[PDB]
């Protein structure tokens, strides 16, 4: 019951700060409009940086140095990756401390090294592929050993990041799916780059081996009856969580690959999910503008809330180095959460 009180305190009068971004001051001036979006938001591994990209085209990055974003510098940058094209996915390159990979639904993958002394985001390199190929998702092996780039259909590329991003291998999606017109919806890496977990739209789930740089199909299981939205992994490495649009959220055992626990209070589709860095609490953002916080070990609801028709598409992410979580606010504005006197659950 300690975790329930902790979450309640994290939802209190204080212990909360508004992330002061461009959209925040925009709403402050125009309220005291059509909300663009938040395409994606992804931390650095060491828990001391953050990056995200709205629909306008501008990607913000913060260098966390304070709790309530007091002394946190902010490198705002205009619509990068072209003037017409906007960013859709980014990976933070766990190898170094500054590099970033960004994709813009085009045939060009941009590698930019963000600098903190100035506000200059200088394009370091651009990678290109076949002219028709339209990739939109990039990923980094959590050890910084492989890079993955995926299309909505009929292309999957793996580069070796060590040897100057030499194109290592590729694969046609129709060889992985073997169904009628499947479109990969979400990808994820295993803890320590050894396997790639892919969730198609027709419902299937595939596990590809990427040991020595040669992709191969290990297995395919008919997990869900609708498109798979998100795929997350437990940090301890014992189970991986699958959330779908048919209203189900399962947790699969890693050693044996069989369903072990099911979330049953759900009655709506899932838009995203996330699990804390301690592998203890599981946050589900359903489609009825509502968030839930479940317990991983037992599987019973321990906290609920209600978005109340503010920023229809929400986002949730748990810090990789503290028990804090960034959650969307009212009008596409981010809202930090903390307790200001508890860095981790154990200290509580």
């Amino acid at each position: 019951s300690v975790t329930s009180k902790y979450l309640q305190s994290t939802f209190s009068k204080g212990n909360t700060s508004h992330i002061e971004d461009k959209r925040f001051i925009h709403v402050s001036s125009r309220s005291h409009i059509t909300p663009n979006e938040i395409l994606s938001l992804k931390f650095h591994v060491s828990g001391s940086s953050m990056a995200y990209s709205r629909m306008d085209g501008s990607l913000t990055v913060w260098f966390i140095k304070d709790a309530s974003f007091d002394k946190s510098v902010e490198v705002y940058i205009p619509d990068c990756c072209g003037s017409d094209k906007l960013a859709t996915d980014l990976s933070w390159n766990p190898t170094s401390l500054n590099q970033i990979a960004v994709v813009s639904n085009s045939s060009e993958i941009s590698l930019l090294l963000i600098n903190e002394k100035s506000l200059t985001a200088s394009k370091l390199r651009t990678l290109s592929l076949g002219s028709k190929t339209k990739v939109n998702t990039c990923l980094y092996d959590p050890l910084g050993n492989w890079l993955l780039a995926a299309t909505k259909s009929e292309k999957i590329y793996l580069f070796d990041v060590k040897k100057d991003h030499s194109s290592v291998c590729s694969l046609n999606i129709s060889d992985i799916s073997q169904e009628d017109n499947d479109v990969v919806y979400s990808l994820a890496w295993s803890n320590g780059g050894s396997h790639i977990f892919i969730g198609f739209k027709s419902g299937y789930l595939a596990i590809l081996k990427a040991k020595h740089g040669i992709l191969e199909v290990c297995t395919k299981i008919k997990a869900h009856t609708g498109p798979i939205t998100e795929i997350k992994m437990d940090p301890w490495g014992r189970n991986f969580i699958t959330g779908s649009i048919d209203g189900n959220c399962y947790v699969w055992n890693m050693k044996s690959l069989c369903c072990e626990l099911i979330i049953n209070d759900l009655n709506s589709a899932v838009t995203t999910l996330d699990v804390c860095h301690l592998g203890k609490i599981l946050g589900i953002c359903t489609e009825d503008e509502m968030v839930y916080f479940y317990d991983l070990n037992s599987g019973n609801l321990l906290h609920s809330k209600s978005l109340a028709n503010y920023k229809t598409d929400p986002v949730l992410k748990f810090y990789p180095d503290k028990s804090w979580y960034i959650m969307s606010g009212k009008n596409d504005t981010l809202s930090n959460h903390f307790v200001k006197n508890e860095k981790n659950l154990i200290t509580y």
């Binding site: 591994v45 060491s46 001391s48 766990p94 401390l97 008919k222 997990a223 009856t225 301890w236 014992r238 189900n248 399962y250 044996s256 069989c258 369903c259 072990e260 099911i262 049953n264 301690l278 592998g279 203890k280 070990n297 180095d321 659950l345 154990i346």
Partner: protein, 178 residues
């Protein structure tokens, strides 16, 4: 991973091991609990061949009865064993023998169990992924027998069927365009 003096540094996570009286292992947020009597599995020998699985099913599963459904994972494990055993000899001439034998097995031990589940689709998906290999005549035989003779004349199955039926009617009275 942590950034010290402006350089990355990796470390492993540290956990400790406690011994308790609860049988199922767990990991409560910093430390792992285990059953103390660590040689409880000394008197038992695992299976070596599917034939032994039959021979010992006839003892343990005939006791657990229709309550096998209380543990879904066993359904999945046995069904995947069946699928792999049928796939192993797709070429050979004796495939119909193994098909008949697994038909009898699924009729007598697994299907009554899967009739007991509670809002757990994936387990039934697995059992049907095994069932897909039979002639459809046999699937209709099993389904109809389960409907007519085993819903009645068996208590926990009857309870589960009546609960499901009442719940289905309750939902059916409340279907709307809204």
């Amino acid at each position: 991973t942590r950034i010290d003096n402006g350089i990355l540094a990796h470390k492993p996570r540290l956990i400790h091991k406690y011994k308790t009286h609860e049988p199922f292992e767990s990991l409560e947020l910093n430390s792992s609990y285990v059953f103390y009597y660590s040689e409880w599995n000394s008197n038992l020998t695992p299976f070596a061949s599917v034939n032994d699985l039959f021979e010992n099913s006839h003892i343990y599963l005939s006791i657990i009865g229709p309550y096998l459904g209380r543990i879904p994972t066993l359904l999945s494990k046995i069904s995947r064993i069946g699928v792999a055993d049928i796939q192993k000899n797709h070429g050979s001439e004796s495939l119909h023998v193994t098909i008949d034998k697994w038909i009898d097995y699924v009729r007598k031990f697994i299907f009554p169990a899967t009739s007991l589940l509670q809002n757990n689709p994936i387990a039934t998906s697995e059992v049907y992924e095994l069932m897909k290999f039979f002639p459809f005549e046999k699937r209709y035989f099993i389904y109809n027998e389960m409907m007519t003779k085993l819903s009645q004349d068996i208590l926990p199955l009857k309870v589960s069927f009546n609960k499901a039926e009442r719940e289905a009617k309750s939902i059916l009275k409340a279907l709307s365009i809204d």
